[PDB]
UniProtKB/Swiss-Prot annotation, chain A:
<dbReference type="GO" id="GO:0032993">
    <property type="term" value="C:protein-DNA complex"/>
</dbReference>
<feature type="binding site">
    <location>
        <position position="203"/>
    </location>
    <ligand>
        <name>cis,cis-muconate</name>
    </ligand>
</feature>
<feature type="binding site">
    <location>
        <position position="293"/>
    </location>
    <ligand>
        <name>benzoate 2</name>
    </ligand>
</feature>
<feature type="binding site">
    <location>
        <position position="104"/>
    </location>
    <ligand>
        <name>benzoate 2</name>
    </ligand>
</feature>
<feature type="DNA-binding region" description="H-T-H motif">
    <location>
        <begin position="18"/>
        <end position="37"/>
    </location>
</feature>
<comment type="similarity">
    <text>Belongs to the LysR transcriptional regulatory family.</text>
</comment>
<feature type="binding site">
    <location>
        <position position="128"/>
    </location>
    <ligand>
        <name>cis,cis-muconate</name>
    </ligand>
</feature>
<dbReference type="InterPro" id="IPR000847">
    <property type="entry name" value="Tscrpt_reg_HTH_LysR"/>
</dbReference>
<keyword id="KW-0238">DNA-binding</keyword>
Curated annotation (Swiss-Prot), chain B:
<dbReference type="GO" id="GO:0003677">
    <property type="term" value="F:DNA binding"/>
</dbReference>
<feature type="binding site">
    <location>
        <position position="160"/>
    </location>
    <ligand>
        <name>benzoate 2</name>
    </ligand>
</feature>
<dbReference type="InterPro" id="IPR036388">
    <property type="entry name" value="WH-like_DNA-bd_sf"/>
</dbReference>
<keyword id="KW-0804">Transcription</keyword>
<keyword id="KW-0058">Aromatic hydrocarbons catabolism</keyword>
<feature type="binding site">
    <location>
        <position position="144"/>
    </location>
    <ligand>
        <name>benzoate 2</name>
    </ligand>
</feature>
<dbReference type="InterPro" id="IPR036390">
    <property type="entry name" value="WH_DNA-bd_sf"/>
</dbReference>
<keyword id="KW-0238">DNA-binding</keyword>
<keyword id="KW-0805">Transcription regulation</keyword>
Length: 305, 303
């Protein structure tokens, strides 16, 4: 038998009518009656005095109603009880892009971590496209990326614009311009290393937008898998690359970082959250970004609160 | 006739009586009435209602008044302009891109002409790359553009960030969001008409960039010759199109413009001058823009 068999019987007994029971179940009278019939023909006992109005129970049905109500109610309790032991431990899932690993994100996470010793924190290297998908889908709670998001269900805050830099070998003509800087236009015809080869749109997309925003489109490009390969290939003299300033966490012999003069040769750092987000766990993260930044001397991101 | 007659005629219609107009000019009304009489016979047409004392003008008389306030207003401009001329004749050459003709540019230029009555201004339509190599060579002295410029021989300053908008046929579903606007995301699958088809970079580049900033690369795209075509075709039920806000200068039956909600769905406007530029004419140009920008409630920059 079914619980549906029971809920139907119970609705008929209480209402003492087949109509007030089918309407309160939002079903038709025929299927309702047929199911209780199927219940009776399965038990071998008649529960209802059918034909006598208002509908009432057989003595056997009168006992069955009492056990049925309890059993339905114990199903209700089971479900509830089962839901009480489940899902105690709070988890915050944070998505981020690999390039952000060389900046402040780690120390930010560590601090937030000290602030919440009872919180499970899961970290996932993901791109902005996946982050947006994972956010809307609940899979993550806060994303960090370099590429703006086109999606109304999501909200981006710009945390800080970060300066682009030209990684060059030490013998390169441009290295003579290390102190002062070069312009994007000075790079236009060099072999340029773009990275990562990871799913678009990634940092290579951004670099190209920067050149395109400045009327430029370099033909000598060569996409490479990762940032260390970029730098590594540069320090072997394959060519130049464009990297965030924070990437200067990586120093390789004869690898020389060189500023850009173009006021808009910048890569922004965003935090993305679901549009209607309000967890104190995210604001606490946000506050932690504000705390670290001031500590470091960057301008603070604006008020959540 | 003489200016006397027009001035004399102006006061009688401004101040509605013969004696009250005579008070304004501090002269006798016996000859004043003769002068206005002397005007109508020369024309061979009456200008005022014969005997009516409210007072009021005739069909042809009223038209003449407005013509007169315009002429008299220009004789003052003749007087005022002639005192502040310049030195026999300089030429300032200005480069701009076509899309700027729909915004505040021509009104800036028009008011600029007024500051320098004797100045020969020379307008040249050209894209950014061409404005660069033209400023470096002296062939222009300012360049109004929509593209960023890796300098360094060139100083550019951001004047304003014009909103982008989506041109759509009024039947299009997006047109529901006419007073609420949309996001680029909604355009991902749309038929998008990019303009123009000149040498790149140009506005199409920019739009392809704007989409790129946001992690979007549309596939259903056509590049068309220019803005009118793009709009024309949008009306012709051919697709959608991304325009600067000022394109709404062009209005077509069943065309409607949807605003974009994305914060960076924008088209910047830059003046570009030679790095070491301190000419008074250019400084003057800067201030006209600030003058105009102020008038329209927009932001002034430290130029
Ligand atoms: Cl960082
Ligand atoms: Cl404008």
């Amino acid at each position: 038998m079914e619980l549906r068999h029971l809920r139907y019987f119970v609705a008929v007994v209480e209402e003492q009518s087949f109509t007030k029971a089918a309407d309160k179940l939002c079903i038709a009278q025929p299927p309702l009656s047929r199911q209780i019939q199927n219940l009776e023909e399965e038990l071998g006992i008649q529960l209802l005095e059918r034909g006598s109005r208002p509908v009432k129970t057989t003595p056997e049905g009168h006992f069955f109603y009492q056990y049925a109500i309890k059993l339905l109610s114990n199903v209700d309790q089971m479900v509830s009880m089962t839901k009480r032991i489940a899902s105690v431990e709070k988890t915050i899932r944070i998505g981020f892009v690999g390039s952000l690993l060389f900046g402040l994100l780690p120390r930010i996470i560590h601090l937030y971590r000290q602030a919440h010793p009872n919180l499970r924190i899961e970290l996932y290297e993901m791109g902005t496209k996946a982050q947006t998908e994972a956010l809307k889908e609940g899979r993550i709670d806060a994303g960090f990326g370099r590429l703006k998001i086109s999606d109304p269900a999501i909200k981006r805050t710009l945390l800080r614009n970060e300066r682009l830099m030209v990684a060059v070998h030490a013998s390169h003509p441009l290295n003579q311009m290390k102190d002062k800087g070069v312009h994007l236009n000075d790079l236009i015809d060099e072999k340029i290393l773009l990275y990562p080869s990871s799913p678009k749109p990634n940092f290579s997309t951004h670099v190209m937008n920067i050149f395109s925003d400045h009327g430029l489109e370099p033909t000598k490009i060569n996409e490479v898998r990762e940032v260390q390969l970029a730098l590594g290939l540069v320090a072997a003299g394959e060519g130049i690359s464009l990297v965030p300033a924070s990437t200067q966490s990586i120093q390789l012999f004869n690898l020389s970082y060189v500023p850009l003069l173009d006021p808009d040769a910048i890569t922004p750092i965003y935090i993305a959250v679901r549009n209607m987000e309000e967890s104190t766990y995210i604001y606490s993260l946000y506050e932690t970004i504000r705390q670290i930044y001031a500590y470091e001397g960057f301008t603070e991101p604006p008020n959540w609160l």
